[PDB]
JSON list of C-alpha atoms in Angstrom, two decimals:
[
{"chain": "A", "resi": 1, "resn": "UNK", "atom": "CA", "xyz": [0.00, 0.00, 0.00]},
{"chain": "A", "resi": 2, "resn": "UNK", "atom": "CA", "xyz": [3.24, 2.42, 0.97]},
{"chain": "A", "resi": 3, "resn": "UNK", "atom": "CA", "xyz": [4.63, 3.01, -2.79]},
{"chain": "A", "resi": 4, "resn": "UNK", "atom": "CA", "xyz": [0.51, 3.88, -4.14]},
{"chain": "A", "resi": 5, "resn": "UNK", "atom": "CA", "xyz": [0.27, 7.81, -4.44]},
{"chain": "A", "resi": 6, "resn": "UNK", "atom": "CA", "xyz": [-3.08, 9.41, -4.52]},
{"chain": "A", "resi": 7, "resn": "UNK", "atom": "CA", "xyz": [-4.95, 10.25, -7.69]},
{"chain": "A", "resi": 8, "resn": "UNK", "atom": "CA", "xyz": [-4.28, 13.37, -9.43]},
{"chain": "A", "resi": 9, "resn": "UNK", "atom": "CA", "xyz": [-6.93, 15.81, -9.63]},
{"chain": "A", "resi": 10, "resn": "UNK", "atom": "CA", "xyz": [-9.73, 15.26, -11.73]},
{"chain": "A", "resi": 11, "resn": "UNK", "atom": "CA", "xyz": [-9.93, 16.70, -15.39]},
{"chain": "A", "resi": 12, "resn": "UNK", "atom": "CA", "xyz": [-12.22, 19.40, -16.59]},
{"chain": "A", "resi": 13, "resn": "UNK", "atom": "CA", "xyz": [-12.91, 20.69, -19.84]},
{"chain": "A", "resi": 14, "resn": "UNK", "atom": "CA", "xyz": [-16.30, 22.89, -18.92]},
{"chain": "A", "resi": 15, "resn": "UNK", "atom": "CA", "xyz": [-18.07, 21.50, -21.82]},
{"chain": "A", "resi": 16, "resn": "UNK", "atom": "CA", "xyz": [-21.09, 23.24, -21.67]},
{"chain": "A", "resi": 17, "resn": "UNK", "atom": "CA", "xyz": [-24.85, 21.68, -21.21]},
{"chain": "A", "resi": 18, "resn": "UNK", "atom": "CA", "xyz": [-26.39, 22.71, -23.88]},
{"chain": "A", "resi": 19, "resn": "UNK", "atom": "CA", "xyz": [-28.78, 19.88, -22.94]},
{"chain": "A", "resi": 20, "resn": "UNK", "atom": "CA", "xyz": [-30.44, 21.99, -20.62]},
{"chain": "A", "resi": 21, "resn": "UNK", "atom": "CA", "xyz": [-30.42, 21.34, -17.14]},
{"chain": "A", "resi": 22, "resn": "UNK", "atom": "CA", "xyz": [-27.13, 19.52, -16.96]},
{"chain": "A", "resi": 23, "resn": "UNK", "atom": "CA", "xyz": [-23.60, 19.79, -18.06]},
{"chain": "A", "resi": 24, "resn": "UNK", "atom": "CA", "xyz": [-20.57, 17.29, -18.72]},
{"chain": "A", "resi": 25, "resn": "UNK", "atom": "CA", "xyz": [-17.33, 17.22, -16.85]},
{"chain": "A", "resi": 26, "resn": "UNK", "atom": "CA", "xyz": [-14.28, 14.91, -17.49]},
{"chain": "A", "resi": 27, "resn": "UNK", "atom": "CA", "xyz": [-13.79, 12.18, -15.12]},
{"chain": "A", "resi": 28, "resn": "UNK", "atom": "CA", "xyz": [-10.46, 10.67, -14.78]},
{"chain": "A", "resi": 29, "resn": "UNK", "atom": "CA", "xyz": [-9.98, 7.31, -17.38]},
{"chain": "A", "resi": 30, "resn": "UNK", "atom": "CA", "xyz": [-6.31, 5.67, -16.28]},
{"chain": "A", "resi": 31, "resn": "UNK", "atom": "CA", "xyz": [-4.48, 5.04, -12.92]},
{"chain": "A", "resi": 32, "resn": "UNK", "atom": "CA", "xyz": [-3.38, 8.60, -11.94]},
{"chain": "A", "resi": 33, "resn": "UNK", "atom": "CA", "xyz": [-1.67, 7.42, -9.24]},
{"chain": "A", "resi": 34, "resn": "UNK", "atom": "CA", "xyz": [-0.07, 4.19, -8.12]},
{"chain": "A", "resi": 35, "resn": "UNK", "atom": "CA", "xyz": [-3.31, 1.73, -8.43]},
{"chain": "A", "resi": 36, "resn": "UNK", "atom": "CA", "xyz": [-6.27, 2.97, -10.68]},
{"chain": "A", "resi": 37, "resn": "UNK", "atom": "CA", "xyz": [-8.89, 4.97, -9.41]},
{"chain": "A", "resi": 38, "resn": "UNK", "atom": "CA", "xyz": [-11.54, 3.01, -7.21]},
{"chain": "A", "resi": 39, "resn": "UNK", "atom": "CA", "xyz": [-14.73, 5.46, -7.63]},
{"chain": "A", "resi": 40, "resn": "UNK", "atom": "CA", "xyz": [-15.82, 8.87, -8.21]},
{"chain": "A", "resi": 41, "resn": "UNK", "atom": "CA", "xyz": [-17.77, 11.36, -5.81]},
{"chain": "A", "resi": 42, "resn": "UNK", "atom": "CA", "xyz": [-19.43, 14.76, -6.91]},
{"chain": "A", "resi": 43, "resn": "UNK", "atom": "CA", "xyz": [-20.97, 17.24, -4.92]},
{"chain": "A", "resi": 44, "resn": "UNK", "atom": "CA", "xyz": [-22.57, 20.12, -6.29]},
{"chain": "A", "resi": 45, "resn": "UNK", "atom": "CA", "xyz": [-25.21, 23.25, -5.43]},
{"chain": "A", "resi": 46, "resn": "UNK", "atom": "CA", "xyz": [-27.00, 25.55, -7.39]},
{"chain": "A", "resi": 47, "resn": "UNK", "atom": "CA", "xyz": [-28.31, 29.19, -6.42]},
{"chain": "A", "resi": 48, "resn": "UNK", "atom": "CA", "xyz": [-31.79, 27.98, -6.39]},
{"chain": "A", "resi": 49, "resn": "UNK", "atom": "CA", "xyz": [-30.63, 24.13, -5.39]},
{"chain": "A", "resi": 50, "resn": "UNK", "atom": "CA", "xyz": [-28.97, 22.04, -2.41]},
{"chain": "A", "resi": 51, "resn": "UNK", "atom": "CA", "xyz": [-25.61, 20.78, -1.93]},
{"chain": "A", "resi": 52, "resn": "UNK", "atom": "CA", "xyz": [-26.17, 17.24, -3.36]},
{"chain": "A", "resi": 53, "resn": "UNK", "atom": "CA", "xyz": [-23.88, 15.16, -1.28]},
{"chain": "A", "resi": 54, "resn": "UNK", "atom": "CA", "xyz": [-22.82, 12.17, -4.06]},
{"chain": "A", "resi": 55, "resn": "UNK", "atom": "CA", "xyz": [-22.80, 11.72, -7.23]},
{"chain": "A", "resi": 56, "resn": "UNK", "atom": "CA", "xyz": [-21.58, 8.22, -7.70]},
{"chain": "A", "resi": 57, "resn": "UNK", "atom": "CA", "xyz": [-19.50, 6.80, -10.31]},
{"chain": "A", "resi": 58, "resn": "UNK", "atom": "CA", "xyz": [-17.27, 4.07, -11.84]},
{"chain": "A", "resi": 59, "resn": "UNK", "atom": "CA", "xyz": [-13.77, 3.68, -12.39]},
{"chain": "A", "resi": 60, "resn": "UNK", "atom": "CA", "xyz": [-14.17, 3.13, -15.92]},
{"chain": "A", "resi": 61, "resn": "UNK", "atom": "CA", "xyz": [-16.58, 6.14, -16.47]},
{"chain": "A", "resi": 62, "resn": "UNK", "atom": "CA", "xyz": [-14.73, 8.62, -18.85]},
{"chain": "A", "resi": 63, "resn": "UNK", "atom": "CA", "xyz": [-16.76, 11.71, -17.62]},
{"chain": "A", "resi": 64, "resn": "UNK", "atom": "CA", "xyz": [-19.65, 12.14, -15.53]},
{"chain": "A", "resi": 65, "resn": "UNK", "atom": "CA", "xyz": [-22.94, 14.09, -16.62]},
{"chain": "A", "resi": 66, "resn": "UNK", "atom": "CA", "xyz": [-24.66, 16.30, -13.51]},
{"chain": "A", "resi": 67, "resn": "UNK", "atom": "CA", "xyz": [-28.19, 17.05, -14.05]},
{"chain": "A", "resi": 68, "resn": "UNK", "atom": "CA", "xyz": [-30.67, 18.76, -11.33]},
{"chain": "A", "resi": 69, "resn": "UNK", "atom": "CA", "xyz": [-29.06, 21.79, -11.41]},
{"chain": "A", "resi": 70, "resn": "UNK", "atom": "CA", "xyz": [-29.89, 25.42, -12.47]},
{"chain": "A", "resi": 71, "resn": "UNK", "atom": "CA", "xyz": [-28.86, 26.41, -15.51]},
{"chain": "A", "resi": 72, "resn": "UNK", "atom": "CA", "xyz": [-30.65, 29.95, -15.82]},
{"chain": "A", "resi": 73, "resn": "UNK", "atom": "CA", "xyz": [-28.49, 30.85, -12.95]},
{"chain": "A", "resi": 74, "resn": "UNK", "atom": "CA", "xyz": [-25.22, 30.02, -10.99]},
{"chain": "A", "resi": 75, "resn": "UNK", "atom": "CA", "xyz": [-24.04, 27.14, -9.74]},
{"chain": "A", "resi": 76, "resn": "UNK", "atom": "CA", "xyz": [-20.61, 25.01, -8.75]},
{"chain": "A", "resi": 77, "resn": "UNK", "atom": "CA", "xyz": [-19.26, 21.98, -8.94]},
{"chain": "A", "resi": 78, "resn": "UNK", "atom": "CA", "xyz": [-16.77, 19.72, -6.60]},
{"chain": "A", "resi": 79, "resn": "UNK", "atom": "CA", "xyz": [-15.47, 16.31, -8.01]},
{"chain": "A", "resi": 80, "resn": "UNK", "atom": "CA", "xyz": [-12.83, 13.81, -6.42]},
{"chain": "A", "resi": 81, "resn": "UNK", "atom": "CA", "xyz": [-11.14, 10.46, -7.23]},
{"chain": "A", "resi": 82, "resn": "UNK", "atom": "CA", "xyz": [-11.14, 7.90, -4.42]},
{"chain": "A", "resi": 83, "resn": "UNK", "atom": "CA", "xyz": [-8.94, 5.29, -5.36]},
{"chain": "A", "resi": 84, "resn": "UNK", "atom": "CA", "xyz": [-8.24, 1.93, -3.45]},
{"chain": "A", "resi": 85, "resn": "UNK", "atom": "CA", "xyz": [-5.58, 3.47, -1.20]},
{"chain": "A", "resi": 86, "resn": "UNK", "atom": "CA", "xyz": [-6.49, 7.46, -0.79]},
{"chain": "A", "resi": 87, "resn": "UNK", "atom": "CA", "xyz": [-8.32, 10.66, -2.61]},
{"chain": "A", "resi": 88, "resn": "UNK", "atom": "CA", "xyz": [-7.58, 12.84, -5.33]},
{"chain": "A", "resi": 89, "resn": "UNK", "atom": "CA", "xyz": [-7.56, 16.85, -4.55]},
{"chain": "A", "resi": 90, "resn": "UNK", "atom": "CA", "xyz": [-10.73, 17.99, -5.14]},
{"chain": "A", "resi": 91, "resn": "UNK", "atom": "CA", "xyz": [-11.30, 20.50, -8.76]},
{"chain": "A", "resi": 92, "resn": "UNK", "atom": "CA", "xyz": [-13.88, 22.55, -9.11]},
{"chain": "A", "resi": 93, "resn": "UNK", "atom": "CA", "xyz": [-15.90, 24.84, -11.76]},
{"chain": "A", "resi": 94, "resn": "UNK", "atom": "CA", "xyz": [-18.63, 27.24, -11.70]},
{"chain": "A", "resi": 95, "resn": "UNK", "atom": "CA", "xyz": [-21.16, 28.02, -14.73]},
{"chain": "A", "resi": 96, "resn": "UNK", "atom": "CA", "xyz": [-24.46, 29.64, -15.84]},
{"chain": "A", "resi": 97, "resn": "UNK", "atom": "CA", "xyz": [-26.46, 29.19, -19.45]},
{"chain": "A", "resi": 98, "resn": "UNK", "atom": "CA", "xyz": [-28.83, 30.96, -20.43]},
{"chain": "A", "resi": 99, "resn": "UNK", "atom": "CA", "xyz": [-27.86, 34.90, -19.86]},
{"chain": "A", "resi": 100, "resn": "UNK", "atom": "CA", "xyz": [-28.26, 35.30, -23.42]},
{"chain": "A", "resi": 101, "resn": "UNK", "atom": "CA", "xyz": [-29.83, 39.10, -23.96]},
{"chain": "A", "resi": 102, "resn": "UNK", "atom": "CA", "xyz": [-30.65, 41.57, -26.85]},
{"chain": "A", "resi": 103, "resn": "UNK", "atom": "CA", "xyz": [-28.04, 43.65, -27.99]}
]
């Protein structure tokens, strides 16, 4: 267990939700560390909505898609790694759609 270093931070790329009511952020896909990532957590909260505690996900998930959030207003996101020995260091974005106006 000794020589396994944590997971790096996850990835993000902001790719926007055009969706709607969502948006897509990278999720780790290799062994950051010294043994591969174990799961994923996300926590995120909205101006209008609650910190949602968990957002699981798989290992072998190449990015995770949040929905349940506003998106005509602001809102942020935490993510983390958790693999089988220790955590990755949490990243984190903030984003709003919608704020489109005449001009």
């Amino acid at each position: 267990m000794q020589p396994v270093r944590e997971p790096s931070a996850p990835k993000l790329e902001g790719q926007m939700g055009e969706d709607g009511n969502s948006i897509k952020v990278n999720l780790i896909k290799q062994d950051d560390g010294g043994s591969p990532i174990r799961h994923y957590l996300v926590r995120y909260r909205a101006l209008s909505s609650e910190w949602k505690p968990e957002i699981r996900l798989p290992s072998g998930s190449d990015h995770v898609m949040l929905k349940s959030l506003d998106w005509n207003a602001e809102y942020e996101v935490y993510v983390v790694a958790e693999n089988q020995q220790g955590k990755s260091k949490a990243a984190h974005f903030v984003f709003r759609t919608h704020h489109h106006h005449h001009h």
